[PDB]
PDB file of C-alpha atoms and ligand atoms in Angstrom:
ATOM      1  CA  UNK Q   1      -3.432 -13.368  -3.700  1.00  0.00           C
ATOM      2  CA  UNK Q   2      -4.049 -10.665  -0.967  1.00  0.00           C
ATOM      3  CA  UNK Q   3      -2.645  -7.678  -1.166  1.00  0.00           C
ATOM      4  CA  UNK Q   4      -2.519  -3.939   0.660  1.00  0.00           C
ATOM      5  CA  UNK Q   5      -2.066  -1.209  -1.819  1.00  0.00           C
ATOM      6  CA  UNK Q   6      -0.650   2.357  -1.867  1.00  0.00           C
ATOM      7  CA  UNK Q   7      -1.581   4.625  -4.712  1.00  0.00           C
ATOM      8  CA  UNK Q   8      -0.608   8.970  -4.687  1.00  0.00           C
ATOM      9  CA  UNK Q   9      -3.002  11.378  -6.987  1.00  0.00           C
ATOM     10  CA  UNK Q  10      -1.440  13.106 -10.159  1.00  0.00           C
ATOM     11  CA  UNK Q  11      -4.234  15.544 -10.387  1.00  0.00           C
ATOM     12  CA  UNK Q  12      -3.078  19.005  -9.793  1.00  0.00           C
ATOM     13  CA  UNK Q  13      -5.507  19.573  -6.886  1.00  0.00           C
ATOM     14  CA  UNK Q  14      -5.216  16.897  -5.117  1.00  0.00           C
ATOM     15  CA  UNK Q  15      -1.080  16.354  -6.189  1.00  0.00           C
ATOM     16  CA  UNK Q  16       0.232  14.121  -3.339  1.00  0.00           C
ATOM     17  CA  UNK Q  17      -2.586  12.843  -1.476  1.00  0.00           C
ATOM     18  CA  UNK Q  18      -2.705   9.012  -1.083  1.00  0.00           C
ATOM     19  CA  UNK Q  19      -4.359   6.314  -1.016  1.00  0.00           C
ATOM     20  CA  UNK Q  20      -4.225   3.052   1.346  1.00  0.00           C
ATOM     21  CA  UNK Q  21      -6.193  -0.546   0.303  1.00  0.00           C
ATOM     22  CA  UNK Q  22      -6.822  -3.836  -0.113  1.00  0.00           C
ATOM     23  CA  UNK Q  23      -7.860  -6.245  -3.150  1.00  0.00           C
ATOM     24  CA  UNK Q  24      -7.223  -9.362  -4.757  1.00  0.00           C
ATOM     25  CA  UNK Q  25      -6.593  -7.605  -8.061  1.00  0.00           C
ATOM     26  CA  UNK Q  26      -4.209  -4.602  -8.276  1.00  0.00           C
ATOM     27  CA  UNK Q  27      -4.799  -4.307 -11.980  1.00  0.00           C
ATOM     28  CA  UNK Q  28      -8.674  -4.166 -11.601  1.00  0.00           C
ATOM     29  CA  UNK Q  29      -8.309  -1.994  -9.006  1.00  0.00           C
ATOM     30  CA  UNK Q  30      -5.857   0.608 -10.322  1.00  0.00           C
ATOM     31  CA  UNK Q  31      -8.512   0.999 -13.686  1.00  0.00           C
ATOM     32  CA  UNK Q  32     -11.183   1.522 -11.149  1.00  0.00           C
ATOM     33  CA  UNK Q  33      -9.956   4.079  -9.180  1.00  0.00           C
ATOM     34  CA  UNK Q  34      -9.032   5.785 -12.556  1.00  0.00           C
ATOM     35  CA  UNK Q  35     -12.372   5.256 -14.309  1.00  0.00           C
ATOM     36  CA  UNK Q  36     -11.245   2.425 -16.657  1.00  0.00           C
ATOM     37  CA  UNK Q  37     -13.629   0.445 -14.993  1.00  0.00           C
ATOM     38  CA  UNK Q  38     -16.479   2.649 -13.419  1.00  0.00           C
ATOM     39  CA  UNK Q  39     -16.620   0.740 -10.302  1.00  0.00           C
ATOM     40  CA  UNK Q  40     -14.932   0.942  -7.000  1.00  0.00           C
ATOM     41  CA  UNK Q  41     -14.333   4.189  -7.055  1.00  0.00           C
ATOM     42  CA  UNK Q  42     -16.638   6.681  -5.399  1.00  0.00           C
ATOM     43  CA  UNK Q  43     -14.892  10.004  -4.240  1.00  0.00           C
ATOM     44  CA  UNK Q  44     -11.090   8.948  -5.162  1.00  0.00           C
ATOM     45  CA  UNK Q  45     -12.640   9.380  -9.091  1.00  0.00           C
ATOM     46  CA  UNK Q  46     -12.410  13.278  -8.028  1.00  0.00           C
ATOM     47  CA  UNK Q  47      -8.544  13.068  -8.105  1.00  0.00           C
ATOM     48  CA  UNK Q  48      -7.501  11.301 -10.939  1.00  0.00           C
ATOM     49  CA  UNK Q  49      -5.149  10.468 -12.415  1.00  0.00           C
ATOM     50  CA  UNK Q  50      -3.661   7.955  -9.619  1.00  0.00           C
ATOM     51  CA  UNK Q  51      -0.620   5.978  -9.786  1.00  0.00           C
ATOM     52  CA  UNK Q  52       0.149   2.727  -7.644  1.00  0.00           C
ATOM     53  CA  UNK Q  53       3.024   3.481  -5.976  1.00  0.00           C
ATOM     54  CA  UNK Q  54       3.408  -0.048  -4.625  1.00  0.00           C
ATOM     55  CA  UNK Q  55       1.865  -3.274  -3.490  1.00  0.00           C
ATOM     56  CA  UNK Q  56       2.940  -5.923  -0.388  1.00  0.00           C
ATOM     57  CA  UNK Q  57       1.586  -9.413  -0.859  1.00  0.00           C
ATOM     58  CA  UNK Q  58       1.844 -12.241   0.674  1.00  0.00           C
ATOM     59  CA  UNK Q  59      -0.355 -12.162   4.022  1.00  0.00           C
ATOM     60  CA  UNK Q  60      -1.818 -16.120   3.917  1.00  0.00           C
ATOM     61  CA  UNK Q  61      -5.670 -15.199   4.086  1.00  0.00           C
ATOM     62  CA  UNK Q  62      -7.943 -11.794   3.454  1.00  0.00           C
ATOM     63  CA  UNK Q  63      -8.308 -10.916   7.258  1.00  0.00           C
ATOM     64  CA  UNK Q  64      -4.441 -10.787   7.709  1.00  0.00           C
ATOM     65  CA  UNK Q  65      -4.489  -8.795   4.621  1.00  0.00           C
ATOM     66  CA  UNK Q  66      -7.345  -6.578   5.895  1.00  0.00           C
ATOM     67  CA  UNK Q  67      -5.912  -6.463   9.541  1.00  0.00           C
ATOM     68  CA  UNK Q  68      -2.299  -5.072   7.877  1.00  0.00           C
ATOM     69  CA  UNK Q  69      -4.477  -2.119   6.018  1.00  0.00           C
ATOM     70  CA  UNK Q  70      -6.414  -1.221   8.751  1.00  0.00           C
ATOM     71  CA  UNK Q  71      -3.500  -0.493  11.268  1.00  0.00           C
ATOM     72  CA  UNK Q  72      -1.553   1.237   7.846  1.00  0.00           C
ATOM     73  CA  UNK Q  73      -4.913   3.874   7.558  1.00  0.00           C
ATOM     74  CA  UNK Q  74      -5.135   4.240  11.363  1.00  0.00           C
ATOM     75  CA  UNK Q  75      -1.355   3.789  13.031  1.00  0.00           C
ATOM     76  CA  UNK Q  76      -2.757   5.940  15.664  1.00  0.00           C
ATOM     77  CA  UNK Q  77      -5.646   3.207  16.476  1.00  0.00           C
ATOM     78  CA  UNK Q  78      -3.164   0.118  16.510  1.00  0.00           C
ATOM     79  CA  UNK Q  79      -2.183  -1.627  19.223  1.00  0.00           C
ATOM     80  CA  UNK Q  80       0.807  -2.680  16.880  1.00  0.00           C
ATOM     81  CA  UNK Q  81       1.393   0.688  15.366  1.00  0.00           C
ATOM     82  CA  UNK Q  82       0.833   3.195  17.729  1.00  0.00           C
ATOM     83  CA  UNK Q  83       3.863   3.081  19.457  1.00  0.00           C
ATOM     84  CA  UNK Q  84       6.395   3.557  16.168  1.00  0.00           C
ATOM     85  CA  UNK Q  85       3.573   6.109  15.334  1.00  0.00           C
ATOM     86  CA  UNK Q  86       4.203   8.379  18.084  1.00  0.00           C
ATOM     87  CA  UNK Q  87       7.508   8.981  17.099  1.00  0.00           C
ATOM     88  CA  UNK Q  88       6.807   9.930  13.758  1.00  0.00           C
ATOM     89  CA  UNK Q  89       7.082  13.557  12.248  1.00  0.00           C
ATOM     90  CA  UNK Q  90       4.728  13.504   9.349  1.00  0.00           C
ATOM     91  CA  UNK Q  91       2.188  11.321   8.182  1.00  0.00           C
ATOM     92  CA  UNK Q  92       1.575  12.631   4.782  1.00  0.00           C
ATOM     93  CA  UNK Q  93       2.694  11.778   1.225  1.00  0.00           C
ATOM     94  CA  UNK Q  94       3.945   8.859  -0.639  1.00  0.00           C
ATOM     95  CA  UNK Q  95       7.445   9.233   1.649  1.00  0.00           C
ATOM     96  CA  UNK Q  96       5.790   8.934   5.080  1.00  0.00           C
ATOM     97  CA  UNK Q  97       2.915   6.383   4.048  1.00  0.00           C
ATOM     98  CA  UNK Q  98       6.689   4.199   2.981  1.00  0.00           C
ATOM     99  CA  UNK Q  99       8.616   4.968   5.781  1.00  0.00           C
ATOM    100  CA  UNK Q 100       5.379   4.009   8.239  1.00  0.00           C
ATOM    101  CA  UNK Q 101       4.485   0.599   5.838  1.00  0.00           C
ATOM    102  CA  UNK Q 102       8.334  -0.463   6.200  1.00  0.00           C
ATOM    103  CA  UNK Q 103       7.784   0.144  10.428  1.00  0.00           C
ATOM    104  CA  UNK Q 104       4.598  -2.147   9.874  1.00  0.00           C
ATOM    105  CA  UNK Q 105       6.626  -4.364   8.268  1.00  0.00           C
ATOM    106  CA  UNK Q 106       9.338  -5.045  11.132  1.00  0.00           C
ATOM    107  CA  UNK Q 107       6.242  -4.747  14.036  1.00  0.00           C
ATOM    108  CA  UNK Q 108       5.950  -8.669  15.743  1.00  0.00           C
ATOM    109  CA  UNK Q 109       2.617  -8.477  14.274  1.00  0.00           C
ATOM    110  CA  UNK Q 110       3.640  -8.906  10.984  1.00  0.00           C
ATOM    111  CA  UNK Q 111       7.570  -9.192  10.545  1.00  0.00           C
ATOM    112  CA  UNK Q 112       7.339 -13.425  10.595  1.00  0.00           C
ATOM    113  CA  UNK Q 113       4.646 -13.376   7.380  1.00  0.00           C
ATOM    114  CA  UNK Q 114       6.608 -14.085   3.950  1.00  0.00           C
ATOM    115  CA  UNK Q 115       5.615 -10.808   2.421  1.00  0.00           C
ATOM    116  CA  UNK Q 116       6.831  -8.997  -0.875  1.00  0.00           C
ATOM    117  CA  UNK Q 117       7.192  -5.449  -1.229  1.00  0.00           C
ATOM    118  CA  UNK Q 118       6.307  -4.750  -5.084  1.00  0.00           C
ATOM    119  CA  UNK Q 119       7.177  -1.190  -6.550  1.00  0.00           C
ATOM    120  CA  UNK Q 120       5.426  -0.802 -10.154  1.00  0.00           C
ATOM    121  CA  UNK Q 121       8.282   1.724 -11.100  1.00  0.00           C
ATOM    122  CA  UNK Q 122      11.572   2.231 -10.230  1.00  0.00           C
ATOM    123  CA  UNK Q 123      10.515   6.104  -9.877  1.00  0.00           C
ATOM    124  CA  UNK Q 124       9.169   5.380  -6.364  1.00  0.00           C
ATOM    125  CA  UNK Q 125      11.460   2.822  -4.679  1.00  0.00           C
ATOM    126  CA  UNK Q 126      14.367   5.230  -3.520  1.00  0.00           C
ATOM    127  CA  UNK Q 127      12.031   5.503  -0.338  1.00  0.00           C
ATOM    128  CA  UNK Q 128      12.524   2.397   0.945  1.00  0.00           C
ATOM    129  CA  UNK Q 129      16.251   2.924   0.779  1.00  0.00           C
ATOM    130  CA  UNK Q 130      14.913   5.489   3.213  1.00  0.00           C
ATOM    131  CA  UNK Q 131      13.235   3.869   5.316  1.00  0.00           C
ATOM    132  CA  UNK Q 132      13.812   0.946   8.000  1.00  0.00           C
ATOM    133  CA  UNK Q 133      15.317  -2.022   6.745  1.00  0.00           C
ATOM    134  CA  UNK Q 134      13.001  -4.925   5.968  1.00  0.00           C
ATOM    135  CA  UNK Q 135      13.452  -8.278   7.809  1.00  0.00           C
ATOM    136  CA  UNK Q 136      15.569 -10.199   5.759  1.00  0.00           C
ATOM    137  CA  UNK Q 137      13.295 -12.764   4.721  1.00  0.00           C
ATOM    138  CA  UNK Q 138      10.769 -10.450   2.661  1.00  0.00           C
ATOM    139  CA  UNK Q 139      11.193  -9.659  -0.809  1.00  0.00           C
ATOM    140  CA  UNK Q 140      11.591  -6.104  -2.124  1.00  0.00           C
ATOM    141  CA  UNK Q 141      11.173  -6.168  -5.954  1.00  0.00           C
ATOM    142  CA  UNK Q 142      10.414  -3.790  -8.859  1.00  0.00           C
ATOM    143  CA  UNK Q 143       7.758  -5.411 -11.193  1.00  0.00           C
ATOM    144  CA  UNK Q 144       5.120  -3.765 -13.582  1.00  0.00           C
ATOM    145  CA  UNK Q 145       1.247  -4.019 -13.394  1.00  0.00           C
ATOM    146  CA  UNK Q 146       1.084  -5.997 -16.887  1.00  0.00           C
ATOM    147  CA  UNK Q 147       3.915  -8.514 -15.531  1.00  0.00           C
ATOM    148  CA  UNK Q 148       2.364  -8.849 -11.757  1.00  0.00           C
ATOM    149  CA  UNK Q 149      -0.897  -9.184 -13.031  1.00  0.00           C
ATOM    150  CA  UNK Q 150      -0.282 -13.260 -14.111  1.00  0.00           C
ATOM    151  CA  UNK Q 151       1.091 -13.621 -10.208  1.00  0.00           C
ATOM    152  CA  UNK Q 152      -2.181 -12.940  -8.865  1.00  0.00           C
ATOM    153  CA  UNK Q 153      -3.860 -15.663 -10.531  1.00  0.00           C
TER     154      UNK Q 153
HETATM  155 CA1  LIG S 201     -14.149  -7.262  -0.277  1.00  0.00          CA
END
């Protein structure tokens, strides 16, 4: 199970700001960044409390994983991105770090992987409806932490 993650900060200061990652284990990961767990979480333990927004899964080994969250934290690096990038009006917030994920999504360099989209509630998944459509082989789904959690074993 690979995964790239997208959490946005609850805390009053920081209300909005996101987060973009990678793990193996969304649930471990999600109590870490909120303290559950005091690992894994230097600096983003400043702005709790976090919510995952989503997760996609799917890529077939940790690099492709790690190659899809690289490009998502720096469009403006990637070969693959930087183009959709540039035509972008806002990086910022849960909406744009969507709209630019669903772009990654239908780039050649990743729109032939079999990849689910995973929303943990239904409160955030309205923004895909905003964004491009996926390529019609991915999965877009709405599934809790507790119920993914036996997926990623
Ligand atoms: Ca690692």
């Amino acid at each position: 199970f690979f995964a790239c993650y997208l959490l946005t900060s609850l805390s009053p200061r920081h209300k909005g700001q996101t987060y973009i990652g990678f793990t193996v284990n969304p649930r471990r990961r999600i109590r870490q960044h909120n303290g559950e767990i005091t690992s894994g979480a230097w600096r983003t333990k400043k702005k709790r409390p976090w919510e995952m927004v989503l997760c996609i899964y799917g890529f077939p080994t940790n690099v492709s994983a790690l190659q899809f969250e690289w490009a998502w934290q720096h469009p403006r690096e990637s070969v693959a991105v930087r183009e959709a990038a540039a035509a972008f009006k806002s990086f910022s917030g849960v909406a744009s770090k969507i709209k630019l994920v669903y772009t990654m999504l239908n780039l050649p360099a990743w729109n032939s992987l079999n990849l689910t989209v995973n929303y943990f509630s239904s409160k955030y998944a309205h923004h895909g409806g905003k964004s491009p459509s996926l390529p019609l082989h991915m999965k877009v789904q709405v599934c809790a932490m507790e119920d993914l959690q036996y997926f990623t074993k």
